[PDB]
Amino acid sequence: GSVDSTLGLEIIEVVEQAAIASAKWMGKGEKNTADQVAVEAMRERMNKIHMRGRIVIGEGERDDAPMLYIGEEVGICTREDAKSFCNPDELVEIDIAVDPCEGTNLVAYGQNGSMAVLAISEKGGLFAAPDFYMKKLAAPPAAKGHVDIDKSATENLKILSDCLNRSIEELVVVVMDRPRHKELIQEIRNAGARVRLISDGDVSAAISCAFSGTNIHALMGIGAAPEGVISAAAMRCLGGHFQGQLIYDPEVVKTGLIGESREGNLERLASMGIKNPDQVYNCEELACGETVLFAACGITPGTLMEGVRFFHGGVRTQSLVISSQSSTARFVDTVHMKESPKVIQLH
Amino acid sequence: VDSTLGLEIIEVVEQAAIASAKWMGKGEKNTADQVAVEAMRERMNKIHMRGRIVIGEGERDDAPMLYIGEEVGICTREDAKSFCNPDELVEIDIAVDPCEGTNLVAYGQNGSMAVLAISEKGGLFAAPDFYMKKLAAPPAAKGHVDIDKSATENLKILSDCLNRSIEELVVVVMDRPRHKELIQEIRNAGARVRLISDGDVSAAISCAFSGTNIHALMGIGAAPEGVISAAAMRCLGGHFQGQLIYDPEVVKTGLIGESREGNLERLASMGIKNPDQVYNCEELACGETVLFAACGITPGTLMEGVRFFHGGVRTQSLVISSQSSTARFVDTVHMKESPKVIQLH
Amino acid sequence: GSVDSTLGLEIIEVVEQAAIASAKWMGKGEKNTADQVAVEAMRERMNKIHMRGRIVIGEGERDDAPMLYIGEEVGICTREDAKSFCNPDELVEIDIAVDPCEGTNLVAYGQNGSMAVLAISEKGGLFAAPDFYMKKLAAPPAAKGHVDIDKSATENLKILSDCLNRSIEELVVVVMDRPRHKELIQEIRNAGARVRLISDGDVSAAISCAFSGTNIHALMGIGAAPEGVISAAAMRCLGGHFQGQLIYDPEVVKTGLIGESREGNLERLASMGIKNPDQVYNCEELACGETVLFAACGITPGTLMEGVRFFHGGVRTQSLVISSQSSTARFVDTVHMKESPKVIQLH
Amino acid sequence: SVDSTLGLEIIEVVEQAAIASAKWMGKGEKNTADQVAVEAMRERMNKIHMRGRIVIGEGERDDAPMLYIGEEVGICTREDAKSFCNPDELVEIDIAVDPCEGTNLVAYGQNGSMAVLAISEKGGLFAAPDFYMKKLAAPPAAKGHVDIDKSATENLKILSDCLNRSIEELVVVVMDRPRHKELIQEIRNAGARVRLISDGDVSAAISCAFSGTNIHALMGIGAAPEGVISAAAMRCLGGHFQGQLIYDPEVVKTGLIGESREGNLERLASMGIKNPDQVYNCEELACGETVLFAACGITPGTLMEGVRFFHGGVRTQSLVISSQSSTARFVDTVHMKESPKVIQLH
Ligand SMILES: Nc1ncnc2c1ncn2[C@@H]1O[C@H](COP(=O)(O)O)[C@@H](O)[C@H]1O
Ligand SMILES: Nc1ncnc2c1ncn2[C@@H]1O[C@H](COP(=O)(O)O)[C@@H](O)[C@H]1O
Ligand SMILES: Nc1ncnc2c1ncn2[C@@H]1O[C@H](COP(=O)(O)O)[C@@H](O)[C@H]1O
Ligand SMILES: Nc1ncnc2c1ncn2[C@@H]1O[C@H](COP(=O)(O)O)[C@@H](O)[C@H]1O
Ligand SMILES: [Cl-]
Ligand SMILES: [Cl-]
Ligand SMILES: [Cl-]
Ligand SMILES: [Cl-]
Ligand SMILES: [Cl-]
Ligand SMILES: [Cl-]
Ligand SMILES: [Cl-]
Ligand SMILES: [Cl-]
Ligand SMILES: [Cl-]
Ligand SMILES: [Cl-]
Ligand SMILES: [Cl-]
Ligand SMILES: [Cl-]
Ligand SMILES: [Cl-]
Ligand SMILES: [Cl-]
Ligand SMILES: [Cl-]
Ligand SMILES: [Cl-]
Ligand SMILES: [Cl-]
Ligand SMILES: [Cl-]
Ligand SMILES: [Cl-]
Ligand SMILES: [Cl-]
Ligand SMILES: [Cl-]
Ligand SMILES: [Cl-]
Ligand SMILES: [Cl-]
Ligand SMILES: [Mg+2]
Ligand SMILES: [Mg+2]
Ligand SMILES: [Mg+2]
Ligand SMILES: [Mg+2]
Ligand SMILES: [Mg+2]
Ligand SMILES: [Mg+2]
Ligand SMILES: [Mg+2]
Ligand SMILES: [Mg+2]
C-alpha cells in the first residue's frame, strides 16, 4: 500500500512523550540522562505504532547505541508474530530519522532551543547521513532556489534582502557559536545583518527560517549532517530552502577522532557508497521520498516551540507536525491532565 | 476505542469547519450547515471505525445525512473483520453538530464551530430533540453549584469557589424571551452577562478554561447540544448538569398543538422513566471512553475562525480525550499550496 | 508651540478609564447607562490633562447633551488662569473628536466590538462632521489610492484582490447589517468575497483593515459621519485607505425624524457652510491637522483589542494608541492592580 | 509630588535605548551595544520635564562620561527651571539606570537583555555601590514566607507550599557561575528544575512575579545595583525580593587588585553603610513613596519580546510599572518608518 495517513498524526505522541521525559531533567546538569530518557520514551512510543519502520538516522551504529541504532526495526508491524494484525498500509516499509534530544546540553543547562524530533519517509526516502559535519544554508520559502550554499554569505544576504523585501540590517542570521565560524560571522556582521549565536540546536534554527514571525531568516555555517537531513525533511514539506554539503576535511572542522585524515574520511564515504563527497544536496535530495513526515516537540523554550511546562495537575507541551501527505503544518498545544486539575489555563 | 481515533477526529472537524467557513456571510444558513454535515460525514467514512450516529441532523427518511442510526466509518461495512482490527472494529456512538450556529456562519458572526463527541456504544445519552435546562461551571465549582439552585445562590457559590466577586463573574445566557426573568436575576445579583443568539456549546465549555472570562452558562438550550457539551466537560472535569424541559408554558418546540401531557407521552414511549431527572455530565457522557472535537468556523472564545489566505487555509481546533486525558489545541496551516509566505501565527 | 508630545501617551489613561467604567455595564441591558458612564469617565480624565481642548465631535449640542457637547472646553489649560500654570505646548488649542462608547448596544448585550475611542488634532485639524450618514470605503495601506469609493463593490474587490495578492474568496468584507445595504451585500456575495455583517460599530471594522492578521480587508457601506472622521484619523496615521462621502437623501437612508427631505438636508448642509455635500474626502482631508492622535480601548472583546476583564485583585484592559507625531501604533496591555494581587497573570 | 505623566514618558526612554542597542545584536561589540543604549536613554531623559539625579548608573563622573553617579538629567534641572517647569515637574527624583542589561547577551545575540531604569523621589532608591549582592526573588504568593537567610532547600519547600505545586514543578533561575556550584547542586538535589543564565538576572527576578513565565524564583549572587532596580519592580508588583551585600572575595571577587574583606569593609563604612551584612527587602531597597519601573526588551526574553527590525519599521515590547497609578503596563509598539505597506497586528 502507501504510508498510513494516521502515522502523521500519531507521531505527535511520539515527540510529546520523548520531550516530556527529557524535560524532567532540565537544568539538572545530566546531558546523557536527558538524552537517554528521551531515546527510551521515543523508542517505546514508536514500538506501539502499527508501522514497519527502520532507523536510518539515530543514536549510532548497532553496537555503539543500544537503542534507536542504525538499522533497528521499530513498530508493531516489524514483529513476525504481530504482522498479521497489520493492514497493507501499516506494512509499508518506512525509514525513520530520530533525534530524541536535540540539544542535550541545552536541556542539561536549562537553556533555550532544545526539542525532540523525528522524520519519516518510505524506505529509501531519507538520506542516511553519516555522522560527518555538514555545511548548511537554510532560508524561507520566498528565497528557495534564489539563495545558494555555494554563494558567499554576503551574496546570500543581498539575495535574501531582495526575496524578503527588507534591508540586510532587517535580517537576522543564526550561526552556531564555534571557532570554525569566526570568519563567517565576521562577514555576516560586515554585511550589516544582525546575528543570533546559538550554543547548540541548529535544527530549530533552520526550521525557524520558514515561519514569518520568528525574526530569523537564515541559517548559515556548519552543523551535523544527520540533523541536516531532519531539518531538510521539514523544509521540503514547508517549501523552505535547505541545502547541505558534507565536510570531510579536518582542516575546516575536526570530527574529534584521532587521528582523522581527509583521505581517511574520504575512504569511509567511498566505503559507504557515497560517490561524490563534494556533492551539494538540495532539500528534495536529502528528503527525497514521495511521503515526508516531520514531528517536533519543544523540550526547553525556543523560537519555534514553547518548552515543556510542569504545573499542579499536569504538563503542557507544544509540538510542530508537518506532513507532505496532508500538506499541513500543525502546531499542537497539549495540556496533559494528571489528576482532576482544579484549574485549566486557556494558554 | 482505538488510541488514534482521538487524533483522527482533528481532521474530521477541520474539514467540516473549512467547508462551512466558505459560506461565511453568504446568508445561506442551510448551505453552510449542509456542506459541514457532508464534509464531517465524508471524513468520518475514511476512518477505520464502526460508528453509529446517536445525535445528529434527524431521523432516517427525513435527514439525508448523519441521521439517527446511520452507520459511519470504514469498519461498518462487511466485512470489516477482514479490513480493520479488533480495536477498530469496536462499536462507537457518535454525537454530531457539524455546524453549531448556522445563522452565525450565514451572517459572518462569531461563535460558530463544527463539533462532535464520541464514546463506546451506549456511552452517550441519545438525547431527544427537547429543550434542556443547563448549568455549566469551572472544575473549581464542580459539585458545588447545582442546577436546582437559583441563579443568585449559584453566583454566590461561584464567588467562593472561584475566589472572586460576583461583579468579577461573567455568565452566558441565550438571548431568549424564556430567559427574561433569569437574565434579570443575574443582573440583580451583580454579575456581568454575555447574551448569545445561538451556540451554547462553546459557552458551556469556555467555563472550563481560565482566560476565557466566562465562568458559567445558565438557561435552557437544546438537549443534544447539552450531551455534546457534557462530553467535553466530563473530560475536563468541569461542572455540567442538564434537565429536560417538556412544558410548553416554559418553552415551545414549535410542533403543532404541543402539550406537556403530549411531550410526557413521547418521552415515555421513548424509554425515559423520569423526565424531571437531573443528569450530571458523567451520566450524559457515561461511556468508558469519551472523545470531544471542535473546530472554529467563525472566531469564538476557544478557537479562531477559519481564515483563507494566499496559499492556504488556517484552522484552530480543540480536541479532548479521556483516554489520553488531554486537551489539545490544534493550529493547522493547510498549505494549498507552495505558499511563498507561512505565518507563525 | 506644538501639540505636547506627552498628550499621545496621556490619552492611554483617558480611553482605559472610559472603557473600564462602561465595561461594568456589560450585559446589563442598559445601553444609555453604558454610554453615559464612558462619557463621564472620558471627560473627567481629559479634564485632568494639561491641554486646551475643544470638542468638535461629540454627544450633541450644548443645551441638549450635558457632557462632551459640541464646543465644550476640556482640559486644565482651558481655564482662565491657564498661562500661569501651563507651558506653551500645553496651551496650544487642540480639537477633539469623541466616541466614548462605540457600540452601546454591544455593551448592553455583552457582545463583541465595542470600544472607547477619541481622536485629536490642532484646532481645525479634524472635520467637525454633522450627524449625517456617510458612505465609506476602508482598505489596507497596500490598496491605498487603488480602490476608490466611487467604483463599484465588484470593481473594488478585483482591485483589492490584485493589491493584497489574494483571491476574492480569500477576502473578507465588513458591512453593517442594515436594509440600506441589501444590494451592496448581494453584490459582494456575487463577487465571491466572504462577509461579516455587523449590527453596530463600523469604527473598529474600518481600522481592522489596516492590520494584517485581523482577517478583515475592507469596510463598505454607509455609516455615521462623525464615526467616519474618528476612523479616518487612525487610518491617516496608519497609511490605510479611507474615503468618506456624506449621504443626505432620505430615500437612500433616513435619520428618522422628522418629515425629513433631501432639500431640507441640503439647506442645513449649506447652513453649516458645507458647500459641496457630494464631495468625496480621503482620510488626510478628514483628519488634515499637522498632528493627529488616535486612542481606543476595548470595552468588550473585538478584532483589534481584548475586552475589559475584572478579576480577583484587579482589572485588565487593552488599548490601541496611534500618533502621527511619534509615528507609532501602540498596543497597551494594562493590569490595573487593586492591591495587592496574590497572582499576576502574564497575559 | 512626582509628575503622573513621568510614568508614561519612560516608555519612550527604554524604547529608544533598546532600539539603539538592538541594532548591535550579535555584532560582537558589547561596549558598542552598551554605549548607544546609554546615550539614547540619557538623550531621551533630558527631553523630559523632570528634575533628576542619577544614583545608579555607569560609574563615577571621572570614569563614565554619560549617566554618571550624581549627574543631573531632565529639562527641569536647568538654572531657569522655575520659569518653564511646574511644581510637580520640579520635584527632585532619584534615578537608577541600566541602559543595556546584559551587554554580552546583545553582542552574542542571546536572550535576556533589556534596557531598564527605576525612579523614585530623592532618597527613594538605595544607591547601591558596585558590590555583589546575594538575592532571593519569588512570586507575590511567597512574599515574606521564603527568606534569603534560609537555605535553598527550605525555601523550595516553602515555595512549593505557597505556589501550591510540587518542588519538581518549580523552576529556579541561577546565574551560571563557579560561585554557584553548590547552590545549583542543592536545588537539583531538592528536586527543582533549573534555568542557568550567562547574564541578565534583572529579567529573571521580575519573571518570578508573573504566572506564565514558568519561573518561580531567582537565587544566588548578582550585582547590587541591578538588585535595587529589580526591587523597584518587585515592590510595585508585591513580589518577593531580598538583597544582601557580599564583600568577601573568598565568596566572590570583584577582580580589582588586592581587594580584601577588610578593604571592602573599609570602603562600605566610608560610604556610610552602617551594617554591611544587613538584609534588605524590596521595600527597603526601593523605599520611596513613589516608585517607577521601565523595561524594554533588547533581545528576546521570558518577560519581554526583543526588538524586531522589519520593512518599514521597528517593534518593541516594554513593561512599565507604577506604584502611583498602581499599574503594570505591557507596551507593544510598532514604530512606523515609514508608510509601511504592511502592518502586522502582532
Ligand atoms: N510589517 C510589520 N508590521 C508590524 N510588525 C512586524 C512587521 N513585520 C514583522 N513584525 C514583527 O516582527 C516579528 C518578526 O518578523 P519576521 O522578522 O518577518 O519574522 C513579527 O512577529 C512581528 O512582531
Ligand atoms: N490574576 C490576574 N492577573 C492578571 N490578569 C488576569 C488575572 N486573572 C485574569 N486576568 C485576565 O483576565 C482574563 C480572563 O480571566 P478569567 O476571568 O479567569 O477567565 C485572563 O486571560 C487575563 O487576561
Ligand atoms: N501566509 C500565511 N500563512 C499562515 N497563516 C496565515 C497566512 N496569512 C494569513 N494567515 C492567518 O490568517 C490570519 C489573518 O490573515 P489576513 O487575512 O492577512 O489578515 C493571520 O493572523 C493568520 O492566522
Ligand atoms: N493549570 C494550568 N493549566 C494549563 N496550563 C498551565 C497551567 N498552569 C501553567 N500552565 C502552563 O504553564 C505556563 C507557565 O506556568 P507557571 O509555571 O505558573 O508560570 C503557563 O503559561 C501555561 O502555558
Ligand atoms: Cl519490537
Ligand atoms: Cl537560553
Ligand atoms: Cl560529527
Ligand atoms: Cl512545498
Ligand atoms: Cl532547497
Ligand atoms: Cl489536509
Ligand atoms: Cl478529570
Ligand atoms: Cl446506515
Ligand atoms: Cl444552529
Ligand atoms: Cl420568561
Ligand atoms: Cl428544538
Ligand atoms: Cl467647560
Ligand atoms: Cl474644565
Ligand atoms: Cl454605538
Ligand atoms: Cl472655528
Ligand atoms: Cl438597497
Ligand atoms: Cl443585538
Ligand atoms: Cl456608524
Ligand atoms: Cl503614514
Ligand atoms: Cl479621495
Ligand atoms: Cl493629517
Ligand atoms: Cl470579534
Ligand atoms: Cl568576550
Ligand atoms: Mg538524541
Ligand atoms: Mg542533536
Ligand atoms: Mg448541524
Ligand atoms: Mg446547534
Ligand atoms: Mg458615545
Ligand atoms: Mg457610535
Ligand atoms: Mg548599561
Ligand atoms: Mg547589567
Among C30, A15, A14, C171, CA closest to B24: C171
Give domain limits for chain D. 1-122+290-346, 123-289
Q: How far apart are CA D112 and CA C87, in angstroms?
A: 40
- The values of phi and psi at residue B106, to 5°, are -60, -30
Residue C149: how many CA atoms within 13 Å on its side-chain side?
Answer: 21
Nearby residues of C112 by Cβ (< 8 Å), 6 or more positions away? B110, C106, C300, C301, C302, C307
Nearby residues of A301 by Cβ (< 8 Å), 6 or more positions away? A112, A307, D214, D302
Which cell is B74 given?
A: 470504514
Whether the ω angle into residue A35 lies within 30 degrees of 0, i.e. cis, is no
In SS3 terms, B46-101 reads as CCCCEEEEEECCCECCCCCCCCECCEECHHHCCCHHHHCCHHHHCEEEEEEEEEEC
DSSP assignments along A170-182, one per residue: G-EEEEE--GGGH
- The side-by-side arrangement of strands in the sheet containing D171-175 is D193-197, D171-175, D217-223, D132-138, D240-246, D279-281
Annotated binding-site residue numbers of A: 35, 59, 99, 102-104, 133, 178-180, 200-202, 227
Q: Which CATH superfamily is domain C1-123+291-347 in?
A: Fructose-1,6-Bisphosphatase, subunit A, domain 1 (3.30.540.10)
- CB contact C294 to B (< 8 Å): no
Taking the CB of residue C181, how many other CB atoms lie within 10 A of it? 18
- CB contact B176 to C (< 8 Å): no
- Interface chains of chain A (3 or more CB pairs under 8 Å): B, D
Instruction: Find the DSSP H helices in chain B.
Output: 5-21, 29-44, 80-83, 86-89, 102-107, 151-161, 180-189, 200-206, 223-236, 260-269, 281-284
What's the CA angle centered on C66, arms C65 and C67, to 5 degrees? 95
For residue D152, give the amino acid letter: A
CA dihedral C49, C53, C54, C56 (to 10 degrees): -80
Query: CB D309 to CB A170 under 8 A?
Result: yes
Determine the angle formed by the axes of helices B151-161 and B180-189, rounding to 10 degrees.
40
Q: How many helices (H) and strands (E) does chain A have?
A: 9, 16
If you search the block for the grid coordinates 465549582, which residue do you land on?
Answer: B141
Report the residue from A26, A189, A311 with minimal CB separation from D28.
A189
In testing the pocket of ligand 3, which one of B18, B24, B314 has its CB within 8 Å of the most ligand atoms?
A: B314
Q: Calculate the alpha carbon distances from A160 to A146, A208, A333, B229 in Å.
A: 8, 15, 32, 49
- Interface chains of chain C (3 or more CB pairs under 8 Å): B, D
In SS3 terms, chain C reads as CCCCCCHHHHHHHHHHHHHHHHHCCCCCCCHHHHHHHHHHHHHHHHCCCCCEEEEEECCCCCCCCCCCCCCCEECHHHCCCHHHHCCCHHHCEEEEEEEEEECHHHHHHCCCCCEEEEEEEECCCCCCCCCCEEEEEEECHHHCCCCCCCCCHHHHHHHHHHHCCCCHHHCEEEEECCHHHHHHHHHHHHHCCEEEEECCCHHHHHHHCCCECCCCCEEEEEEEHHHHHHHHHHHHHHCCEEEEEEECCCCCCCCCCCCCCHHHHHHHHHHCCCCCCCCEEEHHHHCCCCCEEEEEEECCCCCCCCCCEEECCEEEEEEEEEECCCCEEEEEEEEEECCCCCCCECC
Q: How far apart are CA B190 and CA C28, in angstroms?
A: 9
- Please report which helix (H) or strand (E) contains residue D30, including its range: helix D30-45
Question: β-strand D114-121 against D92-101: which pairing, if any?
Answer: antiparallel
Calculate how close chain B gets to C108, using CA atoms only, in Å: 9
Residue D127: how many CA atoms within 13 Å on its side-chain side?
Answer: 19
Q: Calculate the alpha carbon distances from C16 to B214, C24, C304 in Å.
A: 21, 13, 15
The single-letter DSSP state of residue B277 is P
- The values of phi and psi at residue D67, to 5°, are 60, 45
If you search the block for the grid coordinates 500654570, which residue do you land on?
Answer: C85
CATH 2.160.20.10 given to domain B122-288: no
Q: How far apart are CA A32 and CA D42, in angstroms?
A: 48
- The side-by-side arrangement of strands in the sheet containing C218-224 is C194-198, C172-176, C218-224, C133-139, C241-247, C280-282
Q: How far apart are CA B95 and CA B98, in angstroms?
A: 10
Which cell is C29 given?
A: 441591558
Query: CB A344 to CB B208 under 8 A?
Result: yes
Question: β-strand D132-138 against D240-246: which pairing, if any?
Answer: antiparallel
Alpha carbon D126 to chain centroid, angstroms: 13
Q: Are A323 and A295 in contact, with CB atoms under 8 Å apart?
A: no
Q: How far apart are CA C228 and CA C205, in angstroms?
A: 11
Grouping H, G, I as helix, E, B as strand and the rest as coil, residue B7 is helix
The CB of D340 under 6 Å from ligand 1? The reply is: yes
Which cell is D9 given?
A: 514618558
Which cell is C47 given?
A: 479634564
For residue C70, give the amino acid letter: I
Q: Which CATH class is domain D1-122+290-346?
A: alpha beta
Q: How far apart are CA D293 and CA D234, in angstroms?
A: 9
- CB contact C194 to B (< 8 Å): yes
Query: CB A215 to CB D164 under 8 A?
Result: no
Query: CB B335 to CB A342 under 8 A?
Result: no
In SS3 terms, D304-323 reads as CCCCEEECCEEEEEEEEEEC
Report the residue from A170, A195, A311 with minimal CB separation from D310.
A170
DSSP assignments along D147-208, one per residue: -TTS-HHHHHHHHHHHTTS-GGG-EEEEE--GGGHHHHHHHHHHT-EEEEESS-HHHHHHHT
Which cell is D122 given?
A: 530623592
In SS3 terms, A188-220 reads as HHHHCCEEEEECCCHHHHHHHCCEECCCCCEEE
In testing the pocket of ligand 3, which one of B307, B317, B330, B345 has its CB within 8 Å of the most ligand atoms?
A: B307
What's the CA angle centered on A228, arms A222 and A233, to 5 degrees? 150
The single-letter DSSP state of residue A83 is G
Q: Are C335 and D328 in contact, with CB atoms under 8 Å apart?
A: yes
Which cell is C258 given?
A: 422628522
Question: β-strand B113-120 against B290-296: which pairing, if any?
Answer: antiparallel
Which cell is B313 given?
A: 487555509
If you search the block for the grid coordinates 480495536, which residue do you land on?
Answer: B87
Which pairs with CB-CB distance under 8 Å and at least 24 residues apart come from D78-85? D81/D51, D84/C87, D84/D49, D85/D49, D85/D51
Q: How far apart are CA C325 and CA C142, in angstroms?
A: 22
If you search the block for the grid coordinates 502582532, which residue do you land on?
Answer: D346
DSSP assignments along A235-284, one per residue: HHHHT-EEEEEEE--TTTS--S-TT--HHHHHHHHHHTT---TTPEE-HH
Beta bridge partners of D276: none
Grouping H, G, I as helix, E, B as strand and the rest as coil, residue A312 is coil
If you search the block for the grid coordinates 425624524, which residue do you land on?
Answer: C257
Q: Are D288 and D124 in contact, with CB atoms under 8 Å apart?
A: yes
- CB contact A215 to B (< 8 Å): no
Q: Calculate the alpha carbon distances from A159 to A168, A185, D64 in Å.
A: 9, 18, 42
| R_g of chain C, CA atoms, integer Å | 20
For residue A145, give the amino acid letter: G
State the distance from the centre of ligand 13 to the C-alpha of C222, rounded, in angstroms: 29
If you search the block for the grid coordinates 464612558, which residue do you land on?
Answer: C38
Q: Are A282 and A311 in contact, with CB atoms under 8 Å apart?
A: no
- Please report which helix (H) or strand (E) contains residue D107, including its range: helix D103-108
Resolution for this model in angstroms, one decimal place?
2.3
Q: How far apart are CA C267 and CA C264, in angstroms?
A: 5
Q: Are D202 and D137 in contact, with CB atoms under 8 Å apart?
A: no
Q: How far apart are CA D155 and CA D161, in angstroms?
A: 10
Determine the angle formed by the axes of helices B29-44 and B5-21, rounding to 10 degrees.
150
Q: Calculate the alpha carbon distances from B329 to A316, B221, B305, C194 in Å.
A: 11, 26, 13, 25
Calculate how close chain A gets to D41, using CA atoms only, in Å: 22
Which cell is C314 given?
A: 484587579
Calculate how close chain C gets to D8, using CA atoms only, in Å: 6
Among B126, B146, B149, CA closest to B136: B146
Grouping H, G, I as helix, E, B as strand and the rest as coil, residue B336 is coil
- The values of phi and psi at residue C219, to 5°, are -115, 125
Among C134, C238, C114, C216, CA closest to C180: C134
- The values of phi and psi at residue D169, to 5°, are -95, 15
Grouping H, G, I as helix, E, B as strand and the rest as coil, residue D340 is coil
Determine the angle formed by the axes of helices C153-163 and C182-191, rounding to 10 degrees.
40
Residue C229: how many CA atoms within 13 Å on its side-chain side?
Answer: 31
Q: How far apart are CA A73 and CA A68, in angstroms?
A: 9
Q: Which approach determined this entry?
A: X-ray
Q: Which CATH class is domain D123-289?
A: alpha beta
Question: β-strand C280-282 against C241-247: which pairing, if any?
Answer: antiparallel
Topology annotation, domain C124-290: D-Maltodextrin-Binding Protein; domain 2 (3.40.190)
In SS3 terms, D248-309 reads as CCCCCCCCCCCCCHHHHHHHHHHHCCCCCCCEEEHHHHCCCCCEEEEEEECCCCCCCCCCEE
- Where b means 16+ CB within 10 Å and e means fewer, B277-286 reads eebbbeebbb
Q: Are C336 and D326 in contact, with CB atoms under 8 Å apart?
A: yes
In testing the pocket of ligand 2, which one of B169, B212, B215, B301 has its CB within 8 Å of the most ligand atoms?
A: B212
CATH code for residues B1-121+289-345:
3.30.540.10
Residue A295: how many CA atoms within 13 Å on its side-chain side?
Answer: 25
- The values of phi and psi at residue B153, to 5°, are -70, -35
State the distance from the centre of ligand 33 to the C-alpha of C207, rounded, in angstroms: 14
Taking the CB of residue C105, how many other CB atoms lie within 10 A of it? 17
Grouping H, G, I as helix, E, B as strand and the rest as coil, residue D224 is helix
Q: How far apart are CA B84 and CA A5, in angstroms?
A: 15
Name the closest-CA residue to atom 13, ligand 4. Answer: D212
Q: Are D103 and D20 in contact, with CB atoms under 8 Å apart?
A: no
Instruction: Find the DSSP H helices in chain A.
Output: 7-23, 31-46, 104-109, 153-164, 182-191, 202-208, 225-238, 262-271, 283-286
Nearby residues of A34 by Cβ (< 8 Å), 6 or more positions away? A22, A25, A26, A28, A101, A104, A107, A108, A299
- Where b means 16+ CB within 10 Å and e means fewer, A89-128 reads bbbbbbbbbbbbbbbbbbbbbbbbbbbbbbbbbbeebbbb
